[PDB]
Design a protein around this ligand. Structure first.
Ligand code: HEM
Ligand SMILES: O[C@@H]1CCCC[C@H]1CNc1cc(Br)cc2[nH]ncc12
Length: 373
């Protein structure tokens, strides 16, 4: 609905995100729109240290505040990590930290770039009247020339949107179980499965638009956060807003709601067990927008789709449920292959990880939810 901020077209993504802020914030937008020249020239940190402190009161609707969070989030990554060679700032200047933490407290999100900023809200259509294909789309902000962030954010964004074609179906599922309508529940479970088989096809495009070397050595440096990071073992200091330094995880698709939400639906208990995999994904729910957090809890509160299918001794229904579970395993087995190509191999050309065993624990938990192998 509209109380969960889910769009019929783009799902958990933000529809037609604002690209422009009020005139009153050009000093923010000037830095955010030129990070590649500013970082590379050495001017970025000084142009943020000079910056006046600006109030947030003039960010009037949601899309304004979201673009602002993206501006401020990307500026911060570039400040903290600099040129991404290892000189890290450990203090973020009050003149930018303070409005960032205040706009963050307002949207119930952490003051750091999250998946909802740099993917869900970091896109435009080139042509309003062409479709959401990679070739009529662009991102608003990047960090460096050759960081391959268009290719990465937008392919991520596109697989998000592909899987959102199945969100439409979720209420149908829950009504069908409560109204005891076996035929339309089976039909919903197979449509969902069709949607997740589709979204795998979309994923194939990563190979055309993201190069392994550029991805491993550049974009990865800027998305890193500061929770368990040796390089900021104690966190970032939000000057004038906090106390002592504060730890906050970097962006990840662990912060994506579509994939967490199909696990919950199908009764795949990714967040159970007290393991590290389950803790990370539970923790990452706090970097989701609150309406989406709240929608994952609506799901967790309905009756188990999975118990309902086991209890009915109904083979077509067990097969449709498995089509779903099998489509998630497909996505994740493919995704493991892309980690192999885009992290593991590039890292092996540097004068398994953890990672990898993380992802294969999530793959394993999915696979083990099949009713019949
Ligand atoms: C559209 C493309 C992508 C999607 C849908 C996606 C989705 C996800 C999801 C849902 C997770 C959480 C674990 C899970 O649920 O499986 C995850 C974790 C991860 N993904 Fe991806 N991802 C994408 C692109 C990439 C690329 C290109 C790479 C590597 C080059 C990558 C590397 C990772 C890594 C390293 C993790 C685990 C550690 C972390 O959170 O960063 N992903 N991804
Ligand atoms: O540790 C990894 C190193 C490689 C890239 C970034 C980080 C993980 N961060 C991510 C961020 C976004 Br935005 C989308 C994603 N999709 N999959 C991972 C992932």
């Amino acid at each position: 609905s509209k109380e969960y901020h889910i769009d019929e077209e783009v799902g958990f993504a933000l529809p037609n995100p604002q690209e422009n802020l009020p005139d009153f914030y050009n000093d923010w937008m000037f830095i955010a729109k030129h990070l590649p020249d500013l970082i590379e020239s050495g001017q970025l940190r000084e142009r943020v240290e000079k910056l006046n402190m600006l109030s947030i009161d003039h960010l009037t609707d949601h899309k304004s505040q979201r673009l602002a969070r993206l501006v401020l989030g990307c500026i911060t990554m570039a400040y903290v990590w600099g040129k991404g060679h290892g000189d890290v700032r450990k203090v973020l200047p009050r003149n930018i930290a303070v409005p960032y933490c205040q706009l963050s407290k307002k949207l119930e999100l952490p003051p750091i770039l999250v998946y909802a900023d740099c993917v869900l809200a970091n896109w435009k259509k080139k042509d309003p009247n062409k479709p959401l294909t990679y070739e009529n789309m662009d991102v608003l902000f990047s960090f460096r020339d050759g960081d391959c962030s268009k290719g990465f954010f937008l392919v991520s964004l596109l697989v998000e949107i592909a899987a959102a074609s199945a969100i439409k179906v979720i209420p149908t599922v829950f009504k069908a179980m409560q109204m005891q309508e076996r035929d339309t529940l089976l039909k919903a479970l197979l449509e969902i499965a069709s949607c997740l088989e589709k979204a795998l096809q979309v994923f194939h495009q990563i190979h055309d638009h993201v190069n392994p070397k550029a991805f491993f050595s550049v974009l990865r440096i800027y998305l890193s956060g500061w929770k368990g990071n040796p390089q900021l073992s104690d966190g970032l200091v939000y000057e004038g807003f906090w106390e002592d330094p504060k730890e906050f995880a970097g962006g990840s698709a662990g912060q994506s709601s579509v994939f967490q939400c199909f696990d919950v639906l199908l009764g795949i208990q990714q967040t159970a067990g007290g393991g590290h995999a389950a803790q990370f994904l539970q923790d990452m729910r706090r970097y989701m927008p609150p309406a989406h957090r709240n929608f994952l809890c609506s799901l967790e509160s309905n009756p188990s789709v999975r118990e309902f299918v086991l209890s009915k001794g109904d083979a077509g229904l067990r097969e449709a449920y498995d089509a779903c579970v099998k489509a998630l395993v497909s996505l994740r087995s493919y995704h493991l292959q892309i980690v192999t190509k885009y992290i593991l191999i590039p890292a092996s050309q540097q004068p398994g990880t953890d990672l990898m065993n993380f992802l294969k624990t999530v793959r394993s938990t999915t696979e083990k939810s099949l009713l019949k192998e």
